[PDB]
Amino acid sequence: TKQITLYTATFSPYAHRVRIALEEAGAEYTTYDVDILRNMPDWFPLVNPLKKIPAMTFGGPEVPPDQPSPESAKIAESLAMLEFIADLFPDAKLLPTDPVLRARARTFMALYENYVNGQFRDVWFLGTPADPLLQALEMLQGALPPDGGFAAGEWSIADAAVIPFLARMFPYLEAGLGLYSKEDGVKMRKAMASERFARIRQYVRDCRARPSFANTWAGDAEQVEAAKTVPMLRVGEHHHH
Amino acid sequence: TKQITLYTATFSPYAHRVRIALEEAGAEYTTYDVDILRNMPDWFPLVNPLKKIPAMTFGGPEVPPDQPSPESAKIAESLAMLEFIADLFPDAKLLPTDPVLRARARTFMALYENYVNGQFRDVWFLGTPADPLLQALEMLQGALPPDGGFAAGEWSIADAAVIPFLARMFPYLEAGLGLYSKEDGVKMRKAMASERFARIRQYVRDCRARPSFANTWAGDAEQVEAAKTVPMLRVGEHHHH
Ligand SMILES: N[C@@H](CCC(=O)N[C@@H](CSc1ccc([N+](=O)[O-])cc1[N+](=O)[O-])C(=O)NCC(=O)O)C(=O)O
Ligand SMILES: N[C@@H](CCC(=O)N[C@@H](CSc1ccc([N+](=O)[O-])cc1[N+](=O)[O-])C(=O)NCC(=O)O)C(=O)O
Ligand SMILES: [Ca+2]
């Protein structure tokens, strides 16, 4: 019954994770957009002392999001939130019940967070070389069940964790967003269209076809525009190696 | 009934996490050391294609650890293993039952993994300045309950995740091991002994006092000697400014 408020922004794949999970859970919840990159509200550190989105409040009296209550629990870090929503809504089966299959979900989230996420971050924001990102994506793709299905078989929070980032890659590449070189943009677009990455393309289509994605996605062109408001995605800067 | 084998190495904090959790769970399990850094066994990629420790096998027929069975589940990534052990041993209460307290545990693991671990890596393996690491440690200390207790109050896998890294810091500093300068080594030793870091010292003492730590620790001097075998810790080498 306790209220959930998620502080969010359209561009953010980290925040997107949690919106997907809340939709899959069937939760009642409130979202509130926060201009974290240009004009952080003075009250925002009350909901997240790290000053990052997503931020979540849970419980406490029902209050406007821009007047957060000291009585609400303040939850930070998107993966903690995913596990939290799975704990709050056990009937939604946001994780398998079998411990080995639950471990496949946790492993997949850790493979993404530890080996892929940092490569997306560095290729897009620093223009580092794309080959180690493609290698990491090939590794992640190898963790998927070969025949189809999601990271742990049935849909789970592991797929909420990963699809925001993978789903952004294709339209960001097409719009030329990111500090990588022309040569690496070509390299990545060809690779992600190649037979080498057929399995992850089907995974992306399968995650995107779910209502939890459709109802938390502004559309490809609108997300690209959101992303162009990010200062670190400086138009006109590219790095070469 | 299903066997647990953990592929480990004394020096490794990541492997140490999983040993602590298996002790806390009261599990029956086998450990098998792997010389991952100098002489990887040609069979090891069958238990973990990433070629990293820790690696875990679960179930299948009882076999010698250097003859892994294709029938065992192969589990990778230390934090996935920690959640797995909690799932396997629910009566050992390795996570809280309360959703919010559980989220404190998951948040604390994410704070360490996202903001602290990379600072330990940079200072110890690259000799980058120590200040950002001290700052990250102060943030992580701020997440602890100020009056006492573990990350989520009661002991949880969150404390298994973090104590292997914190516990190595003091003996490694005392041994001058790591690529940071003597100046930054003194700076860090002084900082970690000051009242600024009293709370995280109490945290390290409280975690270390548990049998799960004693039974998985070689002793400070022995752990330093294991760490000196790590090529990337470059014993005898320090960067300056
Ligand atoms: N580990 C956290 C990560 C959350 C995070 O990074 N949030 C952002 C998204 S924006 C973002 C996030 C990552 C990177 N990046 O370069 O890695 C760049 C940007 N950006 O906006 O330029 C933020 O709010 N930053 C505000 C701040 O730190 O003051 C989680 O999982 O929830
Ligand atoms: N995310 C994984 C991380 C596991 C990991 O990094 N394991 C190591 C420990 S050694 C290690 C781990 C991290 C760093 N580091 O530079 O950060 C340096 C070293 N090292 O031995 O020099 C390993 O086996 N590496 C072998 C390989 O990659 O082929 C987990 O949580 O289990
Ligand atoms: Ca595979």
Numbering used by the authors:
A (entry chain B), B (entry chain A): 4 to 244
Reproduce the article's own wording on this structure.
To further explore this issue, we have conducted biochemical and crystallographic studies on the interactions of six GSTOs from T. versicolor with chemical libraries. The six TvGSTOs (named TvGSTO1S to TvGSTO6S) used in this study are representatives of the twelve TvGSTOs that have a catalytic serine, while four others have a cysteine instead. In this study, we demonstrated at the biochemical and structural level that T. versicolor GSTs that belong to the Omega class interact with polyphenolic compounds found in wood, and in particular with flavonoids such as dihydrowogonin and naringenin. The ability of TvGSTOs to bind polyphenols through different sites suggests that fungal GSTs could be involved in the transport of various polyphenols.
In order to get a detailed picture of the ligand binding sites of TvGSTO3S, we determined the structures of several complexes with free GSH, or some glutathionylated derivatives GS-R (glutathionyl-dinitrobenzene GS-DNB and glutathionyl-phenylacetophenone GS-PAP), or some of the HBPs identified by TSA (2,4-, 3,4-, 2,3,4-, 2,4,4′- HBPs). TvGSTO3S harbors a canonical GSH binding site (G-site) made up of polar residues from the N-terminal domain which stabilizes the glutathionyl moiety (GS-) of the tested ligands. On the contrary, the hydrophobic binding site (H-site) which hosts the -R group of the GS-R ligand has a singular shape relative to most GSTs. The crystal structures of the different complexes show that this pocket is perfectly suited to accommodate polyaromatic ligands, due to its strong hydrophobic character, while two polar residues are found at the entrance close to the G-site. The phenylacetophenone group of GS-PAP fully fills the cavity, on the contrary to the more polar -R group of GS-DNB that does not enter it and is only slightly stabilized at its entrance, at the interface with the G-site.
